[PDB]
Amino acid sequence: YTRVVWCAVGPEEQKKCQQWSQQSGQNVTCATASTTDDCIVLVLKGEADALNLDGGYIYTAGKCGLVPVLAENRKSSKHSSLDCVLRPTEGYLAVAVVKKANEGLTWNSLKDKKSCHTAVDRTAGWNIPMGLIVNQTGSCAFDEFFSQSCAPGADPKSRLCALCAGDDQGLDKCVPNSKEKYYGYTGAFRCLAEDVGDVAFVKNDTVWENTNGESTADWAKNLKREDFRLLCLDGTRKPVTEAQSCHLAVAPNHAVVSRSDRAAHVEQVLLHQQALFGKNGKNCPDKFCLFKSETKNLLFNDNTECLAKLGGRPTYEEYLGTEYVTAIANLKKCSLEACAF
Ligand SMILES: *[C@@H]1O[C@H](CO)[C@@H](O[C@@H]2O[C@H](CO)[C@@H](O)[C@H](O)[C@H]2NC(C)=O)[C@H](O)[C@H]1NC(C)=O
Ligand SMILES: *[C@@H]1O[C@H](CO)[C@@H](O[C@@H]2O[C@H](CO)[C@@H](O)[C@H](O)[C@H]2NC(C)=O)[C@H](O)[C@H]1NC(C)=O
Ligand SMILES: CCN(CC)CC(=O)Nc1c(C)cccc1C
Ligand SMILES: *[C@@H]1O[C@H](CO)[C@@H](O)[C@H](O)[C@H]1NC(C)=O
Ligand SMILES: [Fe+3]
Ligand SMILES: [Zn+2]
Ligand SMILES: [Zn+2]
Question: What distance in Å separates the CA atoms of residue 124 and residue 118, rounded to the nearest whole number?
Answer without folding.
Answer: 8
